[model samples]
Target: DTKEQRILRYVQQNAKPGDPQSVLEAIDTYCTQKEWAMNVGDAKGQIMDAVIREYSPSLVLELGAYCGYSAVRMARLLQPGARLLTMEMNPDYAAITQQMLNFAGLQDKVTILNGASQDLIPQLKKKYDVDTLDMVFLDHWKDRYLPDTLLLEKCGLLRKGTVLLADNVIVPGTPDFLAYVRGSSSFECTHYSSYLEYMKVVDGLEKAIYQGP
Candidate 1:
C-alpha cells in the first residue's frame, strides 16, 4: 500500500529470513530499481557501517528508524548485549521498522521507541536507564537536528567521545545544524562526501565526535 509497507514486502519476499545483509540488499535493490525511499541507501550506509564497526558502541541511540534500514544496518554490527534504541516519530513507521528488524532476525538488538526525538530523548535516562549514549545516529527530520543535539547535551545524555552521525547535510540541507556542529569547538567533526540515496544528488554524512562535558 504505502512505500514503507511495500519495502517490508519486498524484503520479506526477496531476502533470506535470518540474514540482515540480505535484508539490506533487498531494500537497496528496491529503492534503486523500483523507487526512491530514504533509508540511508548503500553509500552513506557503508560509512555508517564502518563507524559502527570502529566505535563498537555498547549503548547506541538512533534518532530515526525510518523503515529500519539504519537500525538493521547498525544493529548487525553491534556486539553482543549492545543495545540500539531507535526512536521513530511515526507509530506506523515504527511498527514497520520492527518488522524489518525481525525479518533480519536482529530484533533482539534493538529497542523501538515511538515518539518525537525532543520529548523522548529527555526521558531516555529515566525510562530506559540510559545514562550516556555512546553513539547517536541522527536521521530524523532535518529541522530537529540542532535542537535535539542541544537537548541531548542538556539532558546529560552525551559525553566525551560520543559520536553523532547526521545524514542529509547537503541535499535537503541543515545549514543551522551544520553550522552548529562545525562552529562548536567541543565537536570534532568530519564530513564525508557522499550522495543522496538512490540518486546522484550531492549529499554527505557529518560525523561529529562530542568532546564537551
Candidate 2:
C-alpha cells in the first residue's frame, strides 16, 4: 500500500474515537511514506522543545492547530501544570485534531478550538483568566502572523520575557514579519534553518524564533 493508504489504515485502526495523537501519527506516517509537505521536522520541533524548556511556561497559546501534531508536542513538553490552547480556522480540522490529541494521551493538556486567530484569542485569554502567556507558537495564517501577534501583545497576553516561535518562516517566508521583529527593541530574533518534515529537499522550509521580555 502507498504511504497515504497505509496511514489511512493505521488511523482507521488505531486512532481513538476522540484523540489527537492518532491523527498526528497518521499524518506524520503518511507524510513519511509519501511526499513530505507542511509537517514540521524533528529538528524544528527540537527548537520548539528547547524554547518550551527554557520558558517552563504554564500556559501556551498556539495559532493553527493543524492536525494537532504541534499541540501534542507542546503538551508533552509543558511542565505538569502547564496547558496548551491551540486555535484552528477550520472546524473540521479542529475536531480531527482533538481526536489526534487523544491518541497522544494529551487530551487534557491540549485544548483545540475552532476559530481564526483574530476571533478566538479574546475568549481564550478570558478563559485562562490571564492575558500573559509564557510561550506562543505561530504557525497559522502566514499573512496574519504579525497582526495577530500584535493583537496578542496589545491584550497583554504576552508579557516581558515571553518566548515566541514562528514555523515555516522560509518555505512560505515571512520577511516582513521578520523585519518587524528585527526593528523592535523588545524582540530578540534568531533564524533557525530547517527543512520541512519528511522531506529531503533544500527548499520550502525555514524556522525562526523571537524572544521578548
Candidate 3:
C-alpha cells in the first residue's frame, strides 16, 4: 500500500467518524510523525483557513485534492450552505481523497471531480450550477497555475472581489503565475512565507483578489 493508503487506513482506525478536526489531526500526525505526505500541512493550512473565514465564500473551487486534506479543512470552515468543488487528475489519489473527505464528514460539502481542471472548469457553469466562483485554491501543477487561472478568467468563473489562494508558490516556484498576478492591474496579490509541508524548508502562498478585467 502507498503512503496515502496507509494514512487512509490509519485515519479510518484512529479518527472518530463525523469529526473533521480529528481526521485532520490524524493526517497531520501521520504525515509529520510517521511519513511525509504532501497535503498543504498545518501552517499554510491555517493561512488558507484565515482566508476562507474572512471571505466566507459561498462557492469555492480547489484545483488539487491531494488526500482531501485541504478540502476537509476548507469544508469545515465554509459558511452554511457553502460548497467546495475539488479536481484531481490522478484517479488513485482522487479515490483516496474521496475516502478522506468521507472520514472528515465533509463529503456532503465537497464534490470530487476526478479529471483535469482544463476540462472541468468549462463544465462548471452548465453542469454544476457554478455561475461565478467566489474563491479558488490553486495547488495543482506549478506550470499549470497560470494556464488554469487564464482558463478560469476565460470561462468567466472569476469576477471582481473573487479571491485566489495559491500554494507552493516558492518551494517549487511558479514564476509565471506569481509574476502575472503581481504585475497585473486586474489582481491585487500578496505572498505569505512559511515552511513547506512536513518540513522546515521555506515556501510561500499567494493570495490574490480579482479586480475585474
Candidate 4:
C-alpha cells in the first residue's frame, strides 16, 4: 500500500473511534516518525486553529483537502452551526480524504467537494447555498492562489470582512498572491512567520481581510 494508504490504516487501527484529537495525533506521530506526510504539522496547525477560533466563521472553504487533517482540526474548533467545505481536484486523494474524515468523526462537520476549484467554486452558490464565504483557507497549488482569489472576487463569494488565510507563502512561495493581497487597497494583509509543514525551514502564512469593494 502507498504511504497515504498506510496512514489511513494507521489511523483506523491506532486512533480511537470518534476521537478527532486521537486521529490527528496518530497522523502526526506516523508522519513524523514513520513517514513524512504533508498535512500541516502541529506548529502551523496551531496557528490555523487560533485564527479560526478568533474569526469564528460561520461558513468556511478550504481549497485543499490533503488527507483531511486540516479539515478535522478545523472541524473540532468550529463555532456551533458552522460548517467547512473543502475542495480537492484529485479523485484518488479526495477519496482518501473522505475516508480519513470519516474515521476522524468529522464527516458531519466538513463536506468534501470532489472537483477542481475553478469549477466547484462556481457551483458553491447553488450547490451549498453559500452566498458569501466568511473565511477561506488556501493550501492548494501555489500558482493557483492568485487566480482563484480573483475568481472568488469575480463570483461575489468574497464579501467585506472575508478572511483569507494561505499557507506556504514563503517556502514554495506564492509571489503573485503575496503581491496582490499585500499591495491591494481592498485587503488588509499581514504575514506571520512560521515553519514549513513537517520541516523546520523558514516559511510564512498570510492572512488577508477584505476591506470592501
Candidate 5:
C-alpha cells in the first residue's frame, strides 16, 4: 500500500487519545518509507541535542509538542532534574503524546499541556514556580511563532542566553519571525543548511539564540 493509504488507515484505526506513540510511529514509518513530516528529523534533532548539551538547560519549553517526538528528544537530552514543558494546541494530540511519553518512561521529564503557548505559559510559570525560560522550541502555528516569542519576552520568560530554535524555518517557513529576530540586537541568528528530512536537496533551518540585553 502507498504511504498515503497507510496514513489514512493509521489515522482511522489508531489515532486516538492515549495512543500517540502509534501515531508517531506511523508518522516515522511514513517518513522513513515515504516523504517527510516535520520535527527536526534525525539530523537537526542531533543539532538540537548538541545545543541542549552545550547550554545544559534545566528548564526547557516547546511551543509545539505535536505527538511527543520532540518532547521525547528533549527528555533524552536533559539531565535528571531537568524538565520540559511542551505545549500542544490539540487535546487529542496532547493526550496521545502523554501516553507516548509514559511508554518511553519519559513522562517525568515532559509535561504536555493542551493550549496555545500564550495561554499556557502563564500557568506554566506558576506551576514551575519560575517565569524565566532556558530554551524555547518554536514549532507551532507559523504566524504565531514571532508574536508568541515576543509575548514571552514581554512576560520575561526568555532570559539571557536562552536558545530559541525555529524548525521548518524553510519548509513552512517564517519570514516575519526571522525578520523580527534579525532586527533584534540581543539575538545572534544562524541558519543551518541541512538537507530536507529524507532528501538530498539542501534546505535549512534557523536557530536564533537570544543573548544579553
Candidate 6:
C-alpha cells in the first residue's frame, strides 16, 4: 500500500536477515533498480557514515526515520555501546522503520521513537536520561528543522560540538534553517554537496557543529 512497506518487504526478502551492510545493499539496489523513496539513499549515506566515523558519537538522535535507511546507516557505524534514537511521527513509517532496523539486526542499537520531535525532544533529558546529544540527523519536515534545533538548544540537549546533519537542504530546501545555522555564532556549518537519492538531482546536507549557546 505504501512505498515504505514495499521497501521493507524488499529488504526482508533480499537482504541477509541479520546483516546490516547487506540490508543497505538491498535498499540501494531497490531504490536504484526500482523506485525512489526518500531514505537518504547512497550518496548522502556516505556523508552520514563519514561523520559517524569522524566523531564516533554516543547518544545520537535522528529527527526523521524514513523507512530507517539513515537510522540503520548511523546505527551500523555507532561506536560500541553507542545508541541512536530516531523519531517518526507517522506510525506507518515508524513500524516500517522498526522492521527495517530489526531486519538489519540493529534494533538493539537504534530506538525508534514515535512522536513529533517538538514534543518529544524536551523529554529526552528526564525520560531517556540523555544528558546531551553528540549528534542529531535532521531529515524531517523542512519547517521543523530550525524549530526542533532551537528546541534542542532550549532543553540543553545540545552540548558543545554536537553534530547536526541536515538533509534536503538544497533541493526541496530549508532556507530559513540554513540561514539560522549559518548566521548563528553557536554553530559552525559546512555544506556537503551531493545528489538526491535514486535520482540525478542536486541536493546536499548541512553539517553543523554546536559551539555551545
Show how many residue pairs clash in every candidate, following the order shown. Answer: 0, 16, 0, 0, 0, 0
Q: How would you encode candidate 1's per-residue C-alpha lDDT over 69-146 as one tens digit per residue?
A: 999999999999999999998999999999999989999999999999988998998988998999999889899999
Which whole-number lDDT from 0 to 100 does residue 81 have in model 6? 94
Worst 10 residues of 1 by lDDT: 6-15
Candidate 6 global CA lDDT score: 0.92
Q: C-alpha displacement of 197 in model 5, angstroms?
A: 2.6
Each model's lDDT comes to 0.93, 0.71, 0.93, 0.90, 0.74, 0.92
Instruction: Put down candidate 6 lDDT per residue, 1-213, tens digits, no spaces.
Output: 778788888888789987889999999999898888888989989988998899999889999897999998999998889999999999999999999988889999988999999889989999999999999999999999999999999999988999999999998999999999999999999999999998889899999999986
lDDT of 4 by residue, 1-213 (tens): 788889989999899978989988999999888989878778889999999999999999999897889999898899778899999998887998899888877788889988999999888888778899999999999999999999999989999999999998997899999999999999999888888877778888899999888
RMSD of each: 0.8, 3.8, 0.8, 0.9, 4.6, 0.8
> Judged by lDDT against the true structure, how good is candidate 3?
0.93
| Model 3 stretches astray by more than 4 angstroms | none
On residues 1-213, what C-alpha lDDT tens digit does candidate 2 reach at each position? Answer: 543344445676766555545555666666677556455656576777777787788888888886667887778777787888888888767876776677667888877878888877776657756667777888887887789878887777777677778887776777677678768887877776766677654433232333554
Report RMSD for candidate 3. 0.8
TM value for model 4 = 0.97
Model 6 lDDT at residue 93: 92
Give candidate 2's whole-model lDDT. 0.71
CA displacement after TM-score superposition, residue 20 of candidate 2 (Å): 9.2
**Candidate 1: regions farther than 4 A off:** none
- On residues 9-56, what C-alpha lDDT tens digit does candidate 3 reach at each position? 999999998999999999999998899988899989999988899999
